[PDB]
């Protein structure tokens, strides 16, 4: 994962306040000034704060920043719709060899409907595909909100990583999100196990679906 740690997902109804933690180490946040960036689709990444708490011309004062010890924080007080975006903290790190390091990003959602855990459907490979000497497990993930998930697979009871491909979340017509994850196997690997499991984590809660040969 990333060198500095951000929550994947932060949310509030409009007008509410939220904060985004950015946890690092002595060699980075603990000794050097922090920048915050806002990423909106169709828009170049935008500097939101620099030297911890300074706002560039144009950035509203409802955004504020701070740093303490080895962590920094971005506060948004009075969420507005245009604040919905991905946010990234960044700082110079003296440790590795000298480089900026970034957090993994935080999606801020301005809630417009109740939080919804995803519906997860897991499909085994078809006879047709297995006949073609291939195998694909299909894990489909829909109706979740806010739109952030992480997907883990496991063979029987062991994590796999290899052969896994996962989409980013995309907005549905009902303003909740969808994502999919594919696990590519050999026909042999499919048959040589008792089961495969697709685990979807959303707002801290994991849902698991399992299929077997």
């Amino acid at each position: 994962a990333s060198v500095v740690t951000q929550p994947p997902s932060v949310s509030g109804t409009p007008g509410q306040g939220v904060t985004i933690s950015c946890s690092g180490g002595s060699s980075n946040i603990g000794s050097n000034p922090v920048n915050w960036y806002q990423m909106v689709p169709g828009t170049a990444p935008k500097l939101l704060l620099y030297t911890n708490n300074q706002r560039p011309s144009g950035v509203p004062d409802r955004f504020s920043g701070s740093k303490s010890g080895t962590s920094a924080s971005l506060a948004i007080n009075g969420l507005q719709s245009e604040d919905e975006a991905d946010y990234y903290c960044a700082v110079w790190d003296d440790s590795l060899s000298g480089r900026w390091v970034f957090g993994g990003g935080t999606k801020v959602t301005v809630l417009r409907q109740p939080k919804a855990a995803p519906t997860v459907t897991l499909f085994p490979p078809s006879s047709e595909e297995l006949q073609a000497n291939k195998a694909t497990l299909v894990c489909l993930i829909s109706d979740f909100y806010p739109g952030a998930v992480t997907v883990a697979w496991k063979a029987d009871s062991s994590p796999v990583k290899a052969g896994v491909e996962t989409t980013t979340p995309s907005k549905q017509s009902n303003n909740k999100y969808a994502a999919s994850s594919y696990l590519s196997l050999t026909p042999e690997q499919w048959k040589s196990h008792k089961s495969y499991s697709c685990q979807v984590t959303h707002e801290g809660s994991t849902v698991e679906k399992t299929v077997a040969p």
Binding site: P45, L47, W92, F102, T121, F123, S126, Q172, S180
Partner: protein, 222 residues
Amino acid sequence: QVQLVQSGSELKKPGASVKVSCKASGYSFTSYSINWVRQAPGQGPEWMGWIDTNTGNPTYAQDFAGRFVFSLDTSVTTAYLQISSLKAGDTAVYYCATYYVDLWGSYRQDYYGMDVWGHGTLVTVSSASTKGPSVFPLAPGGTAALGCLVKDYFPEPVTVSWNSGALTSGVHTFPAVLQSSGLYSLSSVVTVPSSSLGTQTYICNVNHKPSNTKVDKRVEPK
């Protein structure tokens, strides 16, 4: 107003090289350094280094020192990034960045040139060529889901209907995944009462224009 215009999206085979450009304007090009940053799918951005636009000397982050080259053509105030021996892991959006020059005196050549970013250049490392999808059925009271796996096609888009467009209720076609091959795959699914599984006809109609591919696939349980 500081402005950075980056070159268009690129599709390259593994082992090939690519050169992307960053055209700067609105300020004194040779008085302020250019910084380079990439972000690969899922991951947080990674800082690659900077180049002194006066001396021309580049400095590279540890992880990018070797296959990556920063260069300049100052006469057209453009900074370039070249990558050789491209790998799957090089697939990313590549950004150039510099200073809000108004806030950094008259001259600055260091790693703080991170205020203003270009829109980014997507580089996709791919060995894919135009190809139609293979279509396979997806089969698992209450409700249940059946569908079609539209596998290994290129390029986008594929269109999917069910029973010739007649069936729309409970149909959900998912955005495609781009796998490391450079090929895409997607899935479309119909949510239905479980009793309808194998008692009612469900045919997905898949069209892939670039390859002149039309496929009708009936989907049954088991």
